[PDB]
Amino acid sequence: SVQPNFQQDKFLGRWFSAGLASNSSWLREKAAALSMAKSVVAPATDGGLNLTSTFLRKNQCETRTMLLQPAGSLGSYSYRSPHWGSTYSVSVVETDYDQYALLYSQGSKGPGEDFRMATLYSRTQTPRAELKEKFTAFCKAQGFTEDTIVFLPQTDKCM
C-alpha cells in the first residue's frame, strides 16, 4: 500500500520522527531510550532516498543514514541490511507532504521477514494532538496493539 500519485520531490527535506509502533520488543525498548533530534530525506543516486536520522543516545549526538532503494510503485522502497541479513519493504502509506507522513515497513527477505513497523514523521518536532490520534489509529489498523505504540522522546540537542 502506497500514497497515490506519490511525488517524491515533495517528500524531501527535514522531518521529525515523532512516533513508532513495532512488533519487535527489542526495537521498542531501544527506541524509547533514544531522544530524536531531526531527520533529513534527500534524493539518492539510485533514484530512491537517503534517510538521515539524528538522535541523542546516552547523551551523545549520533547520526545514521539509510539507503531506501526504489521498489516498484512510486513511494515504495527497499532497505537492505547485511547486519540483519534481511531486506525490508518501506512504504510511504499516507502523506500530505507539508505536515505529516505515515510510513509502514516490513521484512521481505531473510530472518527479519516477520518484522513490522509503523512510523510517524512530522514537519514540526511537536505535532498536533490530532496527528498523534491519526497515527494511533493507523497503527491499530495495521495490527499494532496500544502498548506497542511509542511516542518517541525528543531533544533540542544535536540540531
Domains annotated for the chain, with CATH where assigned, are 1-159 (2.40.128.20)
| 100 contacts 89 by C-beta, under 8 angstroms | no
DSSP one-letter code for 12? -
Q: Of 114, 119, 127, which is closest to residue 103 (Cα–Cα)?
A: 119
Q: Of 83, 23, 33, 90, which is closest to residue 58 (Cα–Cα)?
A: 33
Resolution of the entry in angstroms = 1.7
Which three cell numbers mark 130?
490530532
Residue 132 CA neighbour count, 13 Å, CB half: 13
> How long a stretch of residues is the chain?
159
Q: Of 92, 70, 95, which is closest to residue 80 (Cα–Cα)?
A: 70
DSSP bridge pairs for 80: 87
Residue 32 CA neighbour count, 13 Å, CB half: 13
> How far from the centroid of its chain's Cα atoms is residue 34's Cα?
14
Residue with grid cell 541479513, as numbered in its chain:
85
Residue 64 CA neighbour count, 13 Å, CB half: 8
